[PDB]
Design a protein around this ligand. Structure first.
Ligand code: HEC
Ligand code: HEC
Length: 312
């Protein structure tokens, strides 16, 4: 009743359709082409990696092992965020200097198309296959040279926008089904809002909207969340939606236990102190954020040809 009213003033349920990003209107042809690309391993120089490799849509939309590659990354290994509902995050996954945000940061959907392979190799690869040319023509009617790096990016972004998970028990609760959550989960919800977690984890994805100078450190357990030295480094407050499916946790992916993840975020400095029973209650609540994984028909990709660059 009032709890439901409070929850609704702090959060929102996943809608049936995704918000249009940068005026990219979704169409069947764009989404279909974007899906082919999402699963296309030949965009990588080795031909062994595709988006699905690190954002497995059948296993939480992310990667189980920290990686040092992808998106032209040139530093140490980092955990991969889930592509599920990423379209609703204004901030993107960040594991670096606050000073670099201004010029290097962008929306999740857009960060998603930052590639390690060069535009030339990618375009040449796609143009080497008749079927891809036809798909680009279907997706971009009216364009004489439809196969471009920018159009590839637009198609992938259209597909990314469709990777949303509606109908989680919590969303049903927000929409009025008071029985969608049991008493144990409702206590967790009340505590999530009463212990101040909402200062950083709120809105449609319960996080993902701002950066903070607080990150996981290897000092319950052998971990803790502490402020970075001189606030030099910042992290995006994690969107907690579907957290049940997205282990391991934090920028480093060092935590596998959801209970531990909740515990290290309860601190005096953040004004989020929790006792063991409350940690368990919040865990119960967070498990109600799992939505319906979108159905995916595995795309049948076209065969390579003499002009298709060879695996390197
Ligand atoms: C592993 C080698 C990866 C491959 C291949 C792709 N991605 Fe990825 N992605 C990876 C990591 C480690 C990260 C965070 C690091 C950083 O570079 O951003 C990401 C991030 C994203 C995001 C951002 C999600 C958010 O901020 O909420 C998206 C939407 C995303 N990745 C999409 C994406 C697509 C569409 C890819 C194929 C073109 C792709 N990634 C490949 C690791 C890896
Ligand atoms: C802002 C100052 C925060 C407050 C208050 C809370 N959290 Fe948080 N959380 C924040 C950040 C910047 C991060 C990422 C840190 C990093 O090292 O990567 C997180 C992360 C989490 C996670 C891990 C989620 C994931 O990887 O999917 C969980 C489970 C989490 N936070 C829970 C949580 C709870 C229950 C809180 C109230 C006690 C809470 N957070 C407060 C920032 C902030």
């Amino acid at each position: 009743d009032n709890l439901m009213e409070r929850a609704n003033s702090m959060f929102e349920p996943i809608p049936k359709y995704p918000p249009v990003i940068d005026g990219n209107e979704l169409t069947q042809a764009k989404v279909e082409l974007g899906k082919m690309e999402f699963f296309e391993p030949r965009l990588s120089s080795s031909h062994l990696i595709s988006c699905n490799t690190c954002h497995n849509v059948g296993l939480g939309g992310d990667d189980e092992l920290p990686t040092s590659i992808g998106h032209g990354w040139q530093k140490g290994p980092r955990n991969s965020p889930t592509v599920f509902n990423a379209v609703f995050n204004a901030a993107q996954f960040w594991d670096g200097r606050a000073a670099d945000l201004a010029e290097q940061a962008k929306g999740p959907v857009q960060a998603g198309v930052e590639m390690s392979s060069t535009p030339d190799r990618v375009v040449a690869t796609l143009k080497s296959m008749p079927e891809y040319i036809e798909r680009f023509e279907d997706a971009f009617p009216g364009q004489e040279n439809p196969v471009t790096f920018d159009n590839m990016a637009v198609a992938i972004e259209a597909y990314e926008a469709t990777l949303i998970t509606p109908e989680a028990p919590f969303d049903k609760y927000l929409r009025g089904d008071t029985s969608a959550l049991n008493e144990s989960e409702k206590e967790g919800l009340a505590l999530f809002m009463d212990r101040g977690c909402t200062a950083c984890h709120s809105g449609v994805n319960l996080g993902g909207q701002n950066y903070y100078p607080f990150g996981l450190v290897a000092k319950k357990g052998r971990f803790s969340v502490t402020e970075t030295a001189s606030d030099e480094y910042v992290f995006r407050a994690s969107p907690l939606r579907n957290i049940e499916l997205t282990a391991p946790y934090f920028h480093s992916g060092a935590v596998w236990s959801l209970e531990e993840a909740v515990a290290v975020m309860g601190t005096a400095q953040l004004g989020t102190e929790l006792n063991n029973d409350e940690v368990k209650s919040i865990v119960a609540f967070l498990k109600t954020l799992t939505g319906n994984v979108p159905e995916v028909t595995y795309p049948v990709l076209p065969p390579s040809t003499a002009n298709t660059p060879k695996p390197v």
